[PDB]
Design a protein around this nucleic acid. Structure first.
Ligand SMILES: CN[C@@H]1[C@H](O[C@H]2[C@H](O[C@H]3[C@H](O)[C@@H](O)[C@H](NC(=N)N)[C@@H](O)[C@@H]3NC(=N)N)O[C@@H](C)[C@]2(O)C=O)O[C@@H](CO)[C@H](O)[C@H]1O
Ligand code: FES
Ligand SMILES: [K+]
Ligand SMILES: [Mg+2]
Ligand SMILES: [Mg+2]
Ligand SMILES: [Mg+2]
Ligand SMILES: [Mg+2]
Ligand SMILES: [Mg+2]
Ligand SMILES: [Mg+2]
Ligand SMILES: [Mg+2]
Ligand SMILES: [Mg+2]
Ligand SMILES: [Mg+2]
Ligand SMILES: [Mg+2]
Ligand SMILES: [Mg+2]
Ligand SMILES: [Mg+2]
Ligand SMILES: [Mg+2]
Ligand SMILES: [Mg+2]
Ligand SMILES: [Mg+2]
Ligand SMILES: [Mg+2]
Lengths: 74, 97, 48, 86, 122, 72, 23, 137, 128
RNA sequence: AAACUCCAGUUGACACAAAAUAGACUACGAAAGUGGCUUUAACAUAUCUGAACACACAAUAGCUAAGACCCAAACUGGGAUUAGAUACCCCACUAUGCUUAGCCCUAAACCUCAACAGUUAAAUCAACAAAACUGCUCGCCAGAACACUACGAGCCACAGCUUAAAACUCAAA
């Protein structure tokens, strides 16, 4: 949360997207229902923080591998 | 190669291991003034190592010495000799408050 | 070295000849084995 | 019996405040363990039952000490949210 | 071996106290002892009332007798102290100065036990 | 490192002094580090014993104006 | 765990000891 | 000076007096707090019986004796027989963890007696005799 | 049984102990010692009598001598403490460990086997 | 309620019984087991493994004999509850528990996890519990029940222990 503001601004500055909020189950593995059938998922996910707030791996790390999305992580 | 690489060494900043108050001293059964420092003043019960702060080896020397001094006619059992009530308190126990 | 030290001590040992004299000396002096300890680890000898 | 009377388990009363003396006396007997010992000695506790109770009391202490040690370690983080809004 | 006789005598006068000490030290020599010293711890009040030889005592004299004797002299000397009417209580123990104390380096910290339960999501 | 032995002894004898660290400043030299530099410099001279080398290093800092108050 | 296999031996043994006392 | 909770040892001379009497001279109130009764006996320093009272002697029966109201009544009745003999200050020696352990002490205060000390002399063995078996009720 | 006047194993070697007081020689004897100081002298006597090199104590010959002195120690303890089952098991196991030593020594060096059996008075017996 | 009423309380004298606290310790011993004090003796083995039966041990209960006796306490007796109460609750008392000398030889004798040596990598592993394996050896086990049975043999055991089947029966346990 400390860096949530900074990351969101950079994404807008570089014409890219961000998700620093609570990850609702299904963003990636169920995008068709949530967004629509013709939705286009990310081609690259950059993890600035791979852990969540209870010191466990972010769910998107595992969900991005299921959707064959390459991940970059610190 | 490089000379800035670290070297295999034991921790020099390590602090010496802590010692109990009775470390290096001889615990005799005739020193009732020292044995009364580890017993309750009202019941005469022997205190534990969480109160006395002694080590396992010295806590058993006080216990063995108290039991021997009690049955020999050197130390009371049901109470603490009033003479040793104004001695330095080393045990972590507060009754009144 | 232990034998040499013991050889000196044996002289002081009580004997039948000096038994009566030693008893009187014991009845005049006193030995105190009592000493307390503080929280710092210091021995507090009794002021007697 | 063979010991001197009015030394053991004796508490003096200050300014006629007997209640405080009895509360003080009862706190000395509980901290030393006499109270519960007198209650467990009314009926014979078989060795097997006494060994089952000592284990339960030792495992509860261990758990309660660690549970308390974590509560005192995490009480620093009970302050207000510094990133309110993120 | 080297023993220590914690002797608690009956509260008497000097002439009778010295007669008992000598009578007690001669019993050790008769059993093969090599008496080394005779310390006086002074006359004090007993921690509890001691009943010996049809007498209730409240005071007594404390005397230590350091000596050397064979192992078989302890059982013979413990039976001699039970018949003496001026000896309240007397115990023979191995001298504490013949027991070297191993040097200590300090308290060794103990880390909490690990790997007591399997790392499975119960 | 080899200078950790020298630091451990400086802190015990003298401890962290009044001067406070400035971790932000990358090129910040503490009083203890200054002691280590002199100690190392005097080793290059050839002295092979710590006790004399340690005592001789302190005197130089005192001459340079450094304050080295012992735990006393 | 249950003691359903111990209870069968419990009655078997009780019925056998009660028959030896009768005969 | 200050105030200590430890009883004044007889030998060493002190200045604590009650009506001109030393701690040793004060009479003693022996309370036996049982589970079904509470007996009270006041004695002097020279072991001379002055007063005796109990829940049974006050007209209580069976399960009324193991209450705090019966113990208080027996304390008032023992504090009225000893107050006629010149008793004001007493040393309480309670024996037992019964209901009338503290209630009898209040009844003694409601009879004109002033308590200077509270002694506990509950019999605790260092294992001796074996108690009765636990019950299933 | 070594006389009670015998000096201890350690002290006898020290020089200058021949000319001292009679009281110092009585405190360094076996009379003022325990039973384990007399067993250390019995073992010393057997080694000189039997083994070629006494200094070596890790040899099979020495171990048999050291264990036979313990066996005798237990027989003296069990003649007074008949109901001591603990020391009755230490004796029977020690007699079985010595038989395993005599078998391995009889299979390697029969010359020493006769020497030890004669010195210690052991009548070797074959198992059933 | 019954019981006791030479009863209860204080004080004092007074054990062949049992061993608060310490012990939040985690030790000794083959296990069983062992926690008041002192003293004596004393705790096998310089490869491992190795027995229902050989050899020696083995909680409690129990037998035989002679002693002790505070308390507890199967049986029994009394009181009460209950539809009944050969139980649970109350009281009392005995065998027994103790000692000595012999016997008996059992246990949920279960840390249900054999002994020795070794590893933490790989396929981590049905589940649960106390993570998963390797090497070597001894012992044991092959549906349930009949069956801690019957017979035989052996044993100071004579209502006993150990070893230990089958037939009828079911299609599950
Ligand atoms: C899958 N079959 C289950 C099984 O049925 C079994 C059941 O078998 C029963 C035998 O006839 C009877 O003699 C038998 N009775 C005996 N005294 N031995 C029963 O124990 C047996 N039941 C059982 N093992 N669970 O009854 C038989 C007629 C059955 O249907 C044969 O297939 O057991 C039944 C419960 O008994 C279940 O309801 C069935 O679902
Ligand atoms: S710490 Fe060294 S003896 Fe207690
Ligand atoms: K178990
Ligand atoms: Mg059946
Ligand atoms: Mg005890
Ligand atoms: Mg083997
Ligand atoms: Mg076989
Ligand atoms: Mg068997
Ligand atoms: Mg048995
Ligand atoms: Mg029996
Ligand atoms: Mg009874
Ligand atoms: Mg009935
Ligand atoms: Mg009886
Ligand atoms: Mg068991
Ligand atoms: Mg095996
Ligand atoms: Mg089968
Ligand atoms: Mg059986
Ligand atoms: Mg059978
Ligand atoms: Mg048969």
């Amino acid at each position: 949360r400390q860096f949530s503001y900074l990351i969101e601004n950079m994404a807008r500055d570089c014409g890219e997207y961000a998700h620093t909020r609570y990850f609702r189950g299904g963003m990636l593995t169920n995008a068709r229902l949530l967004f629509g059938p013709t939705v286009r998922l990310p081609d690259l996910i950059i993890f600035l923080h791979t852990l969540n707030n209870i010191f466990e791996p972010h769910v998107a790390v595992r969900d991005a591998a299921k959707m064959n999305i390459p991940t970059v992580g610190i | 190669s490089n000379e800035d690489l670290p070297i295999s060494m034991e921790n020099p900043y390590k602090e010496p291991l802590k010692k109990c108050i009775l470390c290096g001293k001889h615990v005799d059964y005739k020193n009732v003034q020292l044995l009364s420092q580890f017993v309750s003043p009202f019941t005469g019960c022997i205190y534990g190592r969480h109160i006395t702060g002694l080590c396992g080896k010295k806590q058993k020397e006080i216990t063995k010495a108290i039991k021997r001094a009690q049955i020999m006619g050197f130390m009371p059992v049901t109470y603490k000799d009033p003479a040793y009530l104004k001695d330095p308190k080393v045990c972590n126990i507060r009754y009144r408050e | 070295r232990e034998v040499l030290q013991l050889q000196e001590e044996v002289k002081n040992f009580i004997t039948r000849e000096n038994l009566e004299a030693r008893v009187e000396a014991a009845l005049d002096s006193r030995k105190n084995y009592n000493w307390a300890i503080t929280r710092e680890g210091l021995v507090v000898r009794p002021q007697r | 019996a063979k010991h001197l009377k009015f030394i053991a388990r004796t508490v003096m009363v200050q300014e006629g405040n007997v209640e405080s003396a009895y509360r003080t006396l009862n706190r000395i007997l509980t901290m030393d363990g006499l109270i519960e010992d007198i209650k467990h000695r009314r009926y014979y506790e078989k060795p097997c039952r006494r060994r089952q109770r000592e284990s339960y009391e030792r495992c509860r202490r261990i758990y309660n000490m660690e549970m308390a040690r974590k509560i005192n370690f995490l009480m620093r983080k009970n302050r207000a949210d510094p990133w309110q809004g993120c | 071996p080297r023993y220590e006789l914690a002797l608690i005598l009956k509260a008497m006068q000097r002439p009778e106290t010295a007669a008992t000490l000598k009578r007690t030290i001669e019993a050790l020599m008769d059993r093969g002892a090599i008496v080394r010293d005779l310390e006086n711890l002074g006359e004090r009040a007993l921690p509890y009332r001691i009943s010996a030889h049809s007498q209730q005592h409240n005071r007594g004299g404390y005397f230590l007798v350091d000596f050397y004797a064979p192992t078989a002299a302890v059982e013979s000397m413990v039976e001699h102290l039970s018949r003496d009417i001026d000896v309240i209580r007397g115990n023979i123990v191995k001298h504490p100065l013949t027991q070297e104390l191993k040097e200590c380096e300090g308290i060794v910290p103990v880390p909490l036990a690990e790997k007591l339960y399997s790392t499975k999501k119960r | 490192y080899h200078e950790d032995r020298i630091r451990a002894k400086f802190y015990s004898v003298y401890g962290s002094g009044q001067r406070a660290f400035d971790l932000f400043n990358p090129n910040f030299k503490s009083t203890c580090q200054r002691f280590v530099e002199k100690y190392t410099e005097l080793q290059k001279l050839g002295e092979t014993d710590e006790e004399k080398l340690f005592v001789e290093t302190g005197k130089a800092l005192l001459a340079e104006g450094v304050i080295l108050r012992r735990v006393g | 765990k249950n003691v359903l296999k111990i209870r069968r031996r419990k009655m078997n043994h009780h019925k056998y000891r009660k028959l030896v006392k009768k005969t | 000076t200050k105030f200590s909770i430890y009883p004044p040892i007889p030998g060493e001379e002190s200045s604590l007096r009650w009506a001109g009497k030393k701690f040793e001279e004060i009479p003693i109130a022996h309370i036996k707090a049982s589970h079904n009764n509470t007996q009270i006996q006041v004695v002097s320093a020279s072991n001379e019986p002055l007063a005796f009272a109990s829940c049974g002697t006050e007209g209580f029966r069976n399960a009324k004796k193991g209450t705090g109201i019966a113990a208080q009544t027996a304390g008032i009745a023992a504090a009225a027989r000893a107050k006629q003999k010149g008793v004001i200050h007493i040393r309480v020696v309670v024996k037992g963890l019964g209901p009338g352990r503290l209630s009898a002490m209040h009844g003694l205060i409601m009879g004109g007696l002033e308590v200077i000390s509270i002694t506990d002399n509950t019999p605790i063995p260092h294992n001796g005799c074996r108690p009765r078996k636990a019950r299933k009720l | 049984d070594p006389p009670p006047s015998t000096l201890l194993k350690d002290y006898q070697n020290v020089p200058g102990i021949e000319k001292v007081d009679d009281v110092v020689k009585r405190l360094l004897s076996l009379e003022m010692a325990n039973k384990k100081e007399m067993l250390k002298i019995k073992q010393e006597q057997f080694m000189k009598k039997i083994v070629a090199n006494p200094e070596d104590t890790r040899s099979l010959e020495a171990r048999i001598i050291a264990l036979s002195v313990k066996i005798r120690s237990y027989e003296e303890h069990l003649e007074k403490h008949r109901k001591d089952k603990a020391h009755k098991r230490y004796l029977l196991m020690s007699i079985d460990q010595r038989k395993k030593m005599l078998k391995n020594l009889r299979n390697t060096n029969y010359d020493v086997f006769e020497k030890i059996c004669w010195g210690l008075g052991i009548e070797y017996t074959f198992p059933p």
